[PDB]
Amino acid sequence: KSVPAIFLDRDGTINVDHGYVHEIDNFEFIDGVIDAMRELKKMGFALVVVTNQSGIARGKFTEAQFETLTEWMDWSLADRDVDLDGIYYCPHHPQGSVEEFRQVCDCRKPHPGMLLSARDYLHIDMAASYMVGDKLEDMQAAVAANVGTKVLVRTGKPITPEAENAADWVLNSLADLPQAIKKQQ
Ligand SMILES: [Zn+2]
């Protein structure tokens, strides 16, 4: 049977975007998101991170550093009873300085590749799922993927009118999501 999911940006949604974050010391969980994620799991949602990480293509940090940080994030969440169901990332950029990652791709939001991948691997009911992000490109990827509810938060990049045009909900932060969902009945 198919499960509903919350799809999540990383920077600006889960962690404070201090700028090309790739080190444990600069990874700061946003207030209340761990508790919120725990509650979302309890509410029956799969949790799937779908993150653009163009810092890799830019040369700001290596894919290995991202992998190390991601393992740590995964550990840290699991240790607090939050087991992520999937972690997807896109390291690419068409103007990448690092040749290995210099390309157009299907996984860089607004392309919905990461969400489609997660859908297939975890058997996700997209129409009953949510996407949470901070920018237009996230909302565009969500509509392409048939995600039922498109949610912006205010904890990341400043919200643009175009992002709002493409979103259903705007919340202060991911910490507000469980209550907003419960209120839907
Ligand atoms: Zn990609």
From Swiss-Prot:
Family annotation (SUPFAM superfamilies): HAD-like (SSF56784)
Residues bound to Zn(2+): C90, H92, C105, C107
Site (Contributes to substrate recognition): R108
Pathway annotation from the record: Nucleotide-sugar biosynthesis; ADP-L-glycero-beta-D-manno-heptose biosynthesis; ADP-L-glycero-beta-D-manno-heptose from D-glycero-beta-D-manno-heptose 7-phosphate: step 2/4; Bacterial outer membrane biogenesis; LPS core biosynthesis
Keyword Amino-acid biosynthesis belongs to the record: no
Effect of K135A: 8-fold reduction in the affinity binding of HBP
Family: Belongs to the GmhB family.
PANTHER family: D-GLYCERO-BETA-D-MANNO-HEPTOSE-1,7-BISPHOSPHATE 7-PHOSPHATASE
Positions that bind Mg(2+): D9, D11, D134, K135
Enzyme class: hydrolase
Organism whose genome encodes this protein: Escherichia coli (strain K12)
Keyword Membrane: no
Catalytic activity, reaction form: D-glycero-beta-D-manno-heptose 1,7-bisphosphate + H2O = D-glycero-beta-D-manno-heptose 1-phosphate + phosphate
Subunit structure: Monomer.
Keywords, in A-Z order: Carbohydrate metabolism, Cytoplasm, Hydrolase, Lipopolysaccharide biosynthesis, Magnesium, Metal-binding, Zinc
Protein name from the UniProt record: D-glycero-beta-D-manno-heptose-1,7-bisphosphate 7-phosphatase
Impact when changing C107A: Reduces the catalytic efficiencies towards the alpha and beta-anomers of HBP
Free-text comment on the cofactor: Magnesium. Can also use other divalent metal cations as manganese and cobalt.
Active site location: D9, D11
Impact upon substituting R108A: Significant reduction in the catalytic efficiency of hydrolysis of the physiological substrate HBP
Record-marked site positions (Stabilizes the phosphoryl group): T51, K109
Further facts: Phosphatase activity is essential for nucleotide activation (fourth step). Zinc ion does not directly participate in catalysis, but probably functions to stabilize the loop conformation.
Sites where the protein binds substrate: D9, R10, D11, D17, H18, G19, Y20, T51, N52, Q53, S54, R108, K109, K135
Entry cofactors: Mg(2+); Mn(2+); Co(2+); Zn(2+)
